[model samples]
Target: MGDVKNFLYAWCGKRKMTPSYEIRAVGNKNRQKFMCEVQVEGYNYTGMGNSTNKKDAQSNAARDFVNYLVRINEIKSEEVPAFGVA
Candidate 1:
């Protein structure tokens, strides 16, 4: 997993904003699915993710949100570290 979630929190802290996350579990017992949605305080952008587990779901949402910030020039691309460590 990437450290993108921590990165997102750090960015929000710099702006004095809090990021909120909502996670839900669906599907049946044999095959559960996790859905995560992330919202930054006072921002219209929302990041979403679907995964087999909670941790990965949150990571995906965080990564998507960070990428969006990069695309809009809200943050530099280099500030976002590569996914996972070598």
Candidate 2:
């Protein structure tokens, strides 16, 4: 899948805002996982995602945030580039 993080940043950049991501590692030595939460500087919606790595976790969070934007009609579907699996 393409990187939705770029798209998310672009979307926020155009509006003179920035997306902030908070990432942390969870679980024990045998099984560690990364959690990422994304929020825009001036927006209320926040996206959350968990994965085995930090990068993927951020991407997942970005995807979730973008999906939320679409759901709320904040961004049109066509405006978003090809990203994530169907």
Candidate 3:
């Protein structure tokens, strides 16, 4: 939980911004389906990923985690001018 919050806040810079992932298993007949949703503080970063492969959902989640790092790191690297502007 904190990891995601840290990552989002690191990029958002006001705290409270957070990242989260959700997965669902659903099916009516013959086998099941997996759906994944990745969000950033209620914001739709990505949604409804379908995976037929066994590890597809896990892989998707891992990929999104990496994506979160990439975005957050890039945002954190941005240069912010020091001192007051008056």
Candidate 4:
């Protein structure tokens, strides 16, 4: 699969926003689950996800954030070169 992080970065850049992630191990070390929060700097929106790995969690959060932006009209369809499936 492609890098969701890259997709998200591109998306943020296209929208003139800054992107960052806050990730942490949610479960115990032996069976660690990652929780990720996606933040678009200078914006009020935030997205969250939990998964077995940090990468997936981050991607999921980013995906959710994109959906949120689209729903709220922050991201218009034409503004995204390619979207949703990262």
Candidate 5:
């Protein structure tokens, strides 16, 4: 993974906010899926991602949420690190 948890915490810390995440197992026995729901405290939006692994799912979810924040100007693009915040 791209250390997405750290990236998210860094962005949130810059804004004096805290982030939250929830990982759950879903799908069926034949094929299980892990879903990550991510958000910043007090935000009205949530970002989600899914994968076969919980860690990867959470990382992807954080990446998606951070991307959205950058796109909407909620976060500065420059605040993202050079080490693959995507």
Candidate 6:
């Protein structure tokens, strides 16, 4: 919600991820259905996932969403953060 920026890894599900803080400042409180979006190389994709459970949404997004990031090399485990939402 500030100047244009990029995400290291972001969650563009029903809730949006912000770089200013660790938690979602605003999102759908009565959201009944879950979903995820992947934006890669100017391509945007919206996909459906488990609606009731957030963990289900996160797990699917973390793995599949990486498809959007472009990289010629891989990062070490220490460079990546685990699901910190817990």
**Higher-TM-score candidate of 1 and 4:** 1
lDDT, each prediction: 0.86, 0.86, 0.50, 0.78, 0.81, 0.36
Arranged by lDDT, best first: 2, 1, 5, 4, 3, 6
Clashing pairs in 4: none
Q: Estimate each model's TM-score.
A: 0.88, 0.87, 0.38, 0.75, 0.79, 0.30
- What does the lDDT read for residue 8 in candidate 4? 73
Question: Mind giving the per-residue lDDT tens digits that candidate 3 earns over 1-86?
Answer: 22432443354555555545577776644677787765655444573356764346645653455455456554332332111123
Q: Judged by TM-score, which candidate is best?
A: 1
Model 1: lDDT of residue 39: 98
Clashes of each: 0, 0, 0, 0, 0, 0
lDDT of 1 by residue, 1-86 (tens): 46789899988999988789899997777989999999997777989988999989999999889889888888877667744323
Model 3: runs farther than 4 Å from truth? 1-18, 42-44, 52-55, 62-65, 68-86
Model 5 / residue 11 / CA error / Å? 1.4
Write one digit per residue (lDDT tens) for candidate 5, span 54-74. Answer: 888888888888878888888
Question: Which ten residues in a row are the worst by lDDT in model 3?
Answer: 76-85
Which regions of candidate 6 fall more than 4 Å away from where they truly are? 1-32, 42-49, 53-59, 67-74, 83-86
TM-score of model number 3: 0.38
In candidate 5 the C-alpha lDDT for residue 38 amounts to 94
Assess the local accuracy of residue 62 in candidate 4 as a C-alpha lDDT between 0 and 100.
Answer: 81
* Candidate 6 residue-wise lDDT, 51-75, digit = tens: 3455454445444443323232333
Angstrom error at residue 1, model 2: 2.9
- Model 2 — which ten-residue stretch has the worst lDDT? 77-86
| lDDT at position 75, candidate 4 | 72
- Model 3 gets an lDDT of 0.50
**Shift of residue 22 alpha carbon in model 5, Å:** 1.0
Cα lDDT tens digits for candidate 2, 22-72: 999887768789989999976788899898888989998998999999899
